[PDB]
Write a protein that binds this ligand. Structure first.
Ligand code: TIW
Ligand code: TIW
Ligand code: NCA
Ligand code: NCA
Ligand code: CL
Ligand code: CL
Ligand code: CL
Lengths: 467, 467
């Protein structure tokens, strides 16, 4: 990896565009003003993997110089300025980054981190690294969207069952194949694990161990489960034999069995319902069969599967008046799930008097891929510069869009007297009217100065209903 | 990178699930049946970076064993199967992959690649690597959606100007900050460069040189350009000074200057139009000023910018009857651009008699992030197995969704008598009624066996209008 080749191409040219005698460029990131509050997560990964230590070498400078000469068909690369960092700082970036603690849940429109150069010669460096830092939008957005789904699950589980038992296993990550790269898979899976413990995206485990850390051996867990190949390989007329083999191989742990290869309704009513019923009603409460539909309208299919199972298996009514399958039998809907369809399904279940205890959800592309930087309006902008020794507040205020207006001056984040948050502009945090700045230095002059464990991040990101 | 920890968690338990004495599992990838045709691109990256050579070691087996013991809370990992590959094949995968040539443009619902194990003990390995291989959906989808935008641009450039000059520079990649990882940025940028030569996502250059290669030193190009920080740092009252400094700095090369920091209309009509007009009109055809709006309704902003500039600069009428700014002045719309708004903008310009020669487009999130595996229904499924020495044709036919039905048996890709594509099922390619199979072996037993340069991929992906 070469940080000199890790920026948008136009930035290579920006050192020539800043006002002359500029000794400092100070910029900030926010999720501009439902997604009212966002989980701040993922900067520590970027700091450690890409920004810390000796990130400039003579070879990296020469390689960048050669690439940019061809890419621009002109010599515009700031070799002198990069060689300065190499010679003066042993290739360590003279940048200070201050950030809200990871896991913190912050309302939209607040400063989440700031970046500035610590050596006047490196005024151009602050926004060189915008591109790599702005990619924090992704773990922020996955963690936030996963937490909003946890909010919906908690509200329906509490109403239907009177408690939150099992909440942290109700949204399982199925997204490994549906994201755009191996690296995205690990980042996204780790962001989902801020909120839940169920994942099949194995890449998230190694990322959390390497850059965050947990007291437990692993941060996420899974169970044996079939796919269409392991059912259909038996031949169409032998679906029952496949189901029998698989539940017998995994008789003492939970096992998920995709049941829609040919006819989900026939499989639940006849194969599970009658032919293999003796192998289901014998199972432990710690080792249920989890029937998995995987096609059709997600709501209609869940409701019809539950209706079928409720007629073939003993059903109890819990203390809130909702129907509950026996403890050896559960359902997972892992097709077509995103935050909108998750809400539709749990509301449809509630209307038909089915407890949310009966169901869990798997989500793949909806959880990790169908998200953009535009969802929370993640943005990085310069708000303060020093030119000719005088600080000036800088901002953008497009006439066409008031929403794109940026903040002015030196920023700080504070608790309000009512316990909310406020971002103070124009250096007003220096007046000390609002208690301590919540931004902490996390990176300075090539060194990670403050780190958080994954357990702390999870604590910071808890729901109020959990609290 | 560990291939043992690079699959969905449920796949680890699969070896147990298949029918006893299964010696072969054969699977295939398609973009299931506007996006009628898809560009096949990106498999060669995956084969080289992740699948070739010695990918199993004793340390990787031990690492996977220890992770999965905690992740499943049980010892379900197939240590013996992985050890077999390490001992018998020096850790090279006994898999054969056949694929259509990269850059080929293939209608939906055709086999694009197939995967099978070459050793009977490794029947479980075919679908182990599903997760890694299915991530090819992303470069396929970026390349396809980029090509569909090229078709729109070509249609409207041809109609408004009579030729396709400049087509390959008309959609520029702005997506580096808006994708979910560094790895995704390189993959996606490379897939856009199958169809265009303009890009700010520098990561794509290194990936193309390393895994595909080009005759030219670099596959893509850029120009100097401003961002809001380099304008707003001068202070709001000094926008004109920033513009004058930047244009002067890059007088002999094309320069893009974002002009919407405060008032885009005021900047075009008063600052560019009157105050700095002398600086603009003196510029060469090879180095025009490119005015860049970045906010408001994209079609409304483009039309109003062009009306303003048409009244301050000398407009001509080209041979098709469309208006043309002088050659030293162009526009780039780099906000809100996606396949749908691109179409809206070029059609609105045509209706207002504005030649598409006047404009280019910058796309970030829409080009590389706002895409999912569901757009082209990219899907990997087992179609053939051998059990007890007998081949059987296998598939999934969900009752609720006919679209999810998968193909049966051994597959092959052919040309029809009219020159179209057909996928033959059930081994029927062997009858030779449709000539030789189109697919080529690209991977066998740990080695890449056939490969394509980026120049060949570009040629294969050309538009008919270009041919
Ligand atoms: C469908 S609901 C269910 C399922 C399994 C069980 C069997 N173990 C249990 O009960 C204990 C053990 C740990 C998980 N515990 C859960 N408690 C509520 N809900 C859960 N879902 N879940 C899940 C979700 C997705 C996947 C792929 C696998 C598992 C785990 C859930 C509590 C009970 C209820
Ligand atoms: C807005 S139109 C324009 C722009 C610049 C020029 C100045 N050089 C040129 O003309 C020669 C030089 C190479 C590219 N050539 C192009 N030929 C048609 N169209 C193009 N667009 N384009 C672009 C796309 C994205 C970015 C960030 C910068 C530039 C390059 C375009 C031909 C002329 C017309
Ligand atoms: N475990 C599962 O059922 C699963 C995992 C990944 C993708 N789809 C399904
Ligand atoms: N070159 C540009 O104008 C650019 C690049 C990346 C993102 N936005 C704008
Ligand atoms: Cl060095
Ligand atoms: Cl599956
Ligand atoms: Cl910009």
């Amino acid at each position: 990896f070469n940080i000199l080749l890790a920026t948008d191409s136009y930035k290579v040219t920006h050192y020539k565009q800043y006002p002359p005698n500029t000794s400092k460029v100070y910029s900030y990131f926010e999720c501009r003003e439902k997604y009212e509050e966002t989980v701040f997560y993922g900067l520590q990964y970027i700091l450690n993997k890409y920004l810390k230590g000796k990130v400039v070498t003579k070879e990296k400078i020469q390689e960048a110089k050669d690439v940019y000469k061809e890419h621009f068909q002109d010599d515009v690369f700031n070799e002198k300025g990069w060689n300065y960092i190499l010679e003066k700082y042993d290739g360590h970036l003279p940048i200070e980054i201050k950030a809200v603690p990871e896991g913190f849940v912050i309302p939209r429109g607040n400063v989440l981190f700031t970046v500035e150069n610590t050596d006047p010669e490196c005024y151009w460096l602050t926004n060189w690294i915008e591109t790599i830092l702005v990619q924090s939008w992704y773990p922020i957005t996955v963690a936030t969207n996963s937490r909003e789904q946890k909010k919906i699950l908690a509200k329906y589980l509490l109403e239907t069952s009177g408690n939150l038992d099992g909440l942290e296993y109700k949204l399982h990550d199925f997204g490994y194949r549906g994201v755009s790269s191996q690296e995205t898979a690990g980042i996204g899976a780790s962001a989902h694990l801020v909120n839940f413990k169920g994942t099949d995206t194995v890449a998230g485990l190694a990322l959390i161990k390497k850059y965050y850390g947990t007291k437990d051996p692993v941060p996420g867990y899974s169970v044996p489960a079939a796919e269409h190949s392991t059912i259909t390989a038996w031949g169409k007329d032998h679906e029952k034999d496949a189901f029998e083999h698989i539940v017998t191989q995994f008789s003492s742990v939970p096992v998920s069995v995709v049941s829609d290869s040919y006819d989900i309704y026939n499989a639940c009513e006849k194969i599970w319902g009658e032919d293999l019923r003796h192998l289901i009603v014998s199972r432990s409460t710690q080792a249920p069969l989890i029937i998995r539909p995987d096609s059709g309208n997600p709501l209609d299919t869940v409701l019809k599967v539950l209706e079928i199972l409720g007629k073939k298996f003993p059903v109890t009514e819990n203390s809130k008046g909702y129907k509950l399958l026996p403890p050896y039998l559960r359902v997972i809907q892992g097709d077509g799930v995103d935050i909108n369809t998750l809400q539709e399904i749990v509301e449809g279940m509630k209307q038909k008097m089915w407890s949310i205890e009966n169901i869990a959800f798997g989500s793949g592309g909806g959880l990790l891929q169908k998200l953009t930087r535009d969802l929370l309006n993640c943005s990085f902008k310069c708000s303060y510069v020093v030119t000719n020794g005088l600080g000036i507040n800088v901002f953008k205020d497009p006439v066409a869009d008031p929403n794109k207006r940026s903040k002015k001056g030196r920023l700080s984040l504070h608790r309000t007297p009512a316990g909310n948050f406020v971002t103070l502009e124009e250096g007003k945090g220096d007046l000390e009217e609002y208690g301590q700045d919540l931004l902490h230095t996390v990176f300075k002059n090539g060194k990670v100065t403050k780190s958080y464990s994954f357990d702390e991040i999870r604590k910071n990101a808890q729901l109020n209903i959990e609290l």
